[PDB]
Design a protein around this nucleic acid. Sequence first.
DNA 1: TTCTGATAAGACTTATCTGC
DNA 2: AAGCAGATAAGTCTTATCAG
Lengths: 56, 56
Amino acid sequence: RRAGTSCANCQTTTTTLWRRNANGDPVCNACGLYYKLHNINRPLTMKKEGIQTRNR
Amino acid sequence: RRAGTSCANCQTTTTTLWRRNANGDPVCNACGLYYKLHNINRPLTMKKEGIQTRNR
DNA sequence: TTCTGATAAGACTTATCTGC
DNA sequence: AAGCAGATAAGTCTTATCAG
Ligand SMILES: [Zn+2]
Ligand SMILES: [Zn+2]
């Protein structure tokens, strides 16, 4: 998280790690990634509510 | 396939098996399913091009 | 502490397989 | 044969984690 920063795309404000869009504008991990792979914004419709944990 | 039938949601016209929306209107397998689980239309943005095969 | 990449967990989509 | 509704999985894709 962080105070004063919102996802420039999914607009969420709680994302493990923040990244930057190809415009220097803050984006939540999901988004940041999704764009790097689809070179198109992140269809906000798959905007999930909470965040999942994971395992190694 | 089938002549004269288009996906009432994803508009595709090639879907393994056709289903019906809760309005009796033809829908391609993906859609038909996605709605039964999300009780909301199928975000067309995840409209895939071709169709994948699978294995058992 | 910040942020970009690479890796890979396993959540979701949706093709199949059945039973009407 | 045909058309459709439900269940059950199958990898595909999304995306939390791990490094640099
Ligand atoms: Zn976002
Ligand atoms: Zn459809």
